[PDB]
């Protein structure tokens, strides 16, 4: 019997700073035990300082990104070139995903950018459109490896102030763009080591008020 779904592997990672937000994703595309491409980008600039990635089944992922990019275009036409806010984009994507509640998009969606106060924002979606704003989210094949590391290093979970008898927690603070990219690079090198579907290359998209910058780093190709 024809199975309309497939697993294209890979993993994605979104971290939000004070005045910036990064959306990272490995460039490896796979089916079963074969590599399709060592460089197939799945993190996209969608305009209005919104970066988006729909990891999982690449066909459904591409279809969704394509439809959202088109949603941004028609938002400009219908509302006098008004800038689509990250919170408005998030709600719009929920309706795109839930629109196919009974034939779902088999993807974990993450968008990143700046909120209307100019502060870093990351939104994460399940396949059927349940969304939530977070400081931190890993999605895809190696999400289970990366996410608990992010809890520890970004949100300082299970970390207490030395000598305070585990009474005072390590205080929350925003990370610099330099410190965040270090965590992203260490997260993906760790994920590459222990997950077979992750490797080849790492592509990070950084979003500030100035615009969308890109950075690329080599990963292990085994």
């Amino acid at each position: 019997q024809f199975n309309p779904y497939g697993d294209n592997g890979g993993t994605i990672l979104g971290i939000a700073g004070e005045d910036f937000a990064v959306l990272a994703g490995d460039t490896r595309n796979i089916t079963d035990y074969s590599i399709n491409s060592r460089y197939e980008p799945k993190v996209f600039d969608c305009g209005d300082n919104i970066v988006m990635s729909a990891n999982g089944f690449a066909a459904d992922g591409d279809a969704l990104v394509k439809r959202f990019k088109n949603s941004v275009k028609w938002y400009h036409f219908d509302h006098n070139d008004k800038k689509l806010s990250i919170n408005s984009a998030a709600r719009n994507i929920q309706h795109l995903l839930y629109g196919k509640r009974f034939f779902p998009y088999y993807v974990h969606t993450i968008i990143a950018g700046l909120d209307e106060d100019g502060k870093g924002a990351v939104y994460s979606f399940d396949p059927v459109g349940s969304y939530e704003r977070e400081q931190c989210r890993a999605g895809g094949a190696a999400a289970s490896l990366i996410m608990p590391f992010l809890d520890n290093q970004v949100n300082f979970k299970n970390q207490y102030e030395p000598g305070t008898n585990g009474k005072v927690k390590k205080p929350l603070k925003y990370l610099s763009v330099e410190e965040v990219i270090k965590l992203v690079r260490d997260s993906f090198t760790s994920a590459t080591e222990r997950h077979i579907q992750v490797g080849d290359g790492l592509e990070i998209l950084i979003v500030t008020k100035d615009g969308v910058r890109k950075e690329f780093y080599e990963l292990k190709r085994d």
């Binding site: 190696a142 289970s144 490896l145 990366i146 996410m147 608990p148 590391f149 809890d151 520890n152 979970k157 299970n158 970390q159 585990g166 260490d186 997260s187 760790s190 994920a191 080591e193 222990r194």
Partner: protein
């Protein structure tokens, strides 16, 4: 009805500078229902430490079985079994039940009393040996532990530093798994002293 994920639980073992650390959570449940928050998964036969995850009845059975076999070993050999030898005994015993296996993920940890070399090893349910310089992981949050260990770990950590690394690896991994947590225990093992610490972690 997946034997390995009915009761839940995790074990992690790491090596340091002239020392080894083995740690485990304390949860025993029946799927969603948490039953016991005192169920320790790490045992020891002389100076050799064994941590077992998986189906709880088999964890208890194998502990009793390896106590049985190490006791007879010591009486006949007139010496305590070493980690390298015990690892082979575990592998032998598990594969003996190849087509009716114990649903477990055992982890050996200890220091060879002769050479003084730190030793850790992991097994599948049918006794395949997984030897490692760095760390071994096991249980329902093995994916989480692999991610934590691979990032946090660095070689030749001092016993006091190694404790912090293995503890943070277990705690953060256990918090992302529903069937693990409910308290944790960490064994710091030096050549001729062993410290056992109970960790404070979120009880949900």
């Amino acid at each position: 009805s997946d034997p390995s994920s009915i009761n839940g639980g995790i074990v992690v073992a790491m090596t340091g500078k002239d020392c080894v650390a083995i740690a485990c959570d304390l949860r025993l449940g029946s799927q969603s229902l948490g039953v016991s928050n005192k169920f320790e998964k790490i045992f020891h036969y002389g100076h050799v430490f064994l941590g077992i995850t998986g189906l709880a009845t088999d964890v208890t059975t194998l502990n009793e079985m390896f106590r049985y076999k190490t006791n007879l070993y010591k009486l006949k050999e007139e010496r305590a079994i070493e980690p390298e030898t015990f690892t082979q005994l575990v592998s032998s015993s598990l594969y003996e039940r190849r087509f009716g296996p114990y649903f477990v993920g055992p982890v050996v940890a200890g220091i060879n009393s002769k050479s003084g070399k730190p030793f850790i090893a992991g097994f599948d349910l049918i006794g395949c040996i997984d030897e490692a310089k760095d760390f071994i992981v096991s249980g329902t949050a093995s994916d989480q532990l692999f991610g934590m260990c691979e990032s946090l770990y660095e070689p030749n950590l001092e016993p006091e530093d190694l404790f912090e690394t293995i503890s943070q690896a277990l705690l953060n991994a256990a918090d992302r798994d529903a069937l693990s947590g409910w308290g944790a225990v960490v064994y710091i093992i030096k050549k001729d002293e062993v410290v056992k610490r109970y960790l404070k972690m979120r009880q949900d």
